[PDB]
């Protein structure tokens, strides 16, 4: 379990996230899921911050860091030649 | 014709199948006399499937509101 | 042994009150089914009387319960292994044991180690769960309930 | 929805001991009006509640509970 989760922290994401950041962010994700299944509603970030004893700006920062990039070559729709990569300047 | 009801039922069924997969994984790694119905089930795949159907699916289309005939068509 | 209108404590859910007695039959076999519910999880628990001792229900302990819990709550010379993994594996097992005394030293050790070092916030979830279930248990055991039950601990935990 | 919930049979482990069953489903009034959803980029949805019981034959234990299944559009 240790080596598997270390490799998942180190190599899965395209942008490398250190293992302690990974364990912090997925602990926050799992306690957010616990909050969602407990009260049936989306909690404010202040509540999650105060129930985990970190600052709310830290929570905003870490859920901004915990994001997955979207591939450049996503098709737009019915048209096939028009790709997402030619829309960016 | 698969109407809106049968399509939404199929998407909810796929989400429920994923939820049953997750919970079947959960019971085999969980002990008896400590399992609560609030605990072992997870509704994340269900809402994920519903939001995946309603957003960015070829059947759920952006409504054309040129004029009432466009809406009815 | 079991009546109607009384209170019995269920594991992993705290104390609860018995509503009535039903005659539900499971697997085609008639059983003396007893039904009770709790206000925390908003769930109803149906347990037959024949396997009530086997499933692990206990009655409310009277005066004997508070004196022994207070005495253990203040027992000194408590030691734990240096590695946190063994204690982590032992605490949930002692919680699932269901003994009031056992959960008493578990929560006392957890509170003292949380105050002396400030371990983490992940364990705080089960710490709060254990505190809630013990204060729900001593609600009928010590004859003090709700805020009064919480208040009594506020001056005896040190 | 009652068909999609009755289709999910009470499932068993490999020992055939404990099971969960979704008996009845119900809906609550939506927390937002239609114009409120159309204004602040909300989804017109209502919470979905189901009655779920957790039955184990060995202990004879039934845990009937109501669980939030998701915001249903």
From Swiss-Prot, chain A:
According to the record, the residues making up region (Sigma-70 factor domain-3) are 23-89
Highest taxon, organism lineage: Bacteria
The record's family statement is:
Belongs to the sigma-70 factor family.
Subunit structure as annotated in this protein's UniProt entry? Homotrimer (Potential). interacts transiently with the RNA polymerase core complex. Interacts with RNA polymerase-binding protein RbpA via its sigma-2 region (residues 211-347) in a free form.
**What biological function has been recorded for the protein in this entry?**
Sigma factors are initiation factors that promote the attachment of RNA polymerase to specific initiation sites and are then released. This sigma factor is the primary sigma factor during exponential growth. Its activity is stimulated by RbpA.
In Swiss-Prot or TrEMBL terms, this protein is called RNA polymerase principal sigma factor HrdB
- Species name: Streptomyces coelicolor (strain ATCC BAA-471 / A3(2) / M145)
UniProtKB/Swiss-Prot annotation, chain B:
Record protein name field: DNA-directed RNA polymerase subunit beta
This protein's source sits in the domain of life called Bacteria
Q: What is the covered span of the full protein?
A: 364 to 436 of 1161
Q: Which function does this protein serve? A: DNA-dependent RNA polymerase catalyzes the transcription of DNA into RNA using the four ribonucleoside triphosphates as substrates.
Q: Which family does it belong to?
A: Belongs to the RNA polymerase beta chain family.
Q: What species is given as this protein's source?
A: Streptomyces coelicolor (strain ATCC BAA-471 / A3(2) / M145)
**Known partners and oligomeric status:** The RNAP catalytic core consists of 2 alpha, 1 beta, 1 beta' and 1 omega subunit. When a sigma factor is associated with the core the holoenzyme is formed, which can initiate transcription. The RNAP complex including the principal sigma factor HrdB also interacts with RNA-binding protein RbpA.
Q: What is the lineage of its organism?
A: Bacteria, Bacillati, Actinomycetota, Actinomycetes, Kitasatosporales
Curated annotation (Swiss-Prot), chain D:
Coiled-coil residues are none
Record's family? Belongs to the RNA polymerase beta chain family.
Q: What superkingdom heads the lineage?
A: Bacteria
Question: Lineage of the native species?
Answer: Bacteria, Bacillati, Actinomycetota, Actinomycetes, Kitasatosporales
Name of protein? DNA-directed RNA polymerase subunit beta
Give the species this sequence originates from.
Answer: Streptomyces coelicolor (strain ATCC BAA-471 / A3(2) / M145)
Name the gene behind this protein.
Answer: rpoB
Q: May I ask which residue range the UniProt record assigns to the signal sequence? A: none
Report the transmembrane regions from the record.
Answer: none
Task: Give the multimer and partner information.
Answer: The RNAP catalytic core consists of 2 alpha, 1 beta, 1 beta' and 1 omega subunit. When a sigma factor is associated with the core the holoenzyme is formed, which can initiate transcription. The RNAP complex including the principal sigma factor HrdB also interacts with RNA-binding protein RbpA.
Query: What's its job?
Result: DNA-dependent RNA polymerase catalyzes the transcription of DNA into RNA using the four ribonucleoside triphosphates as substrates.
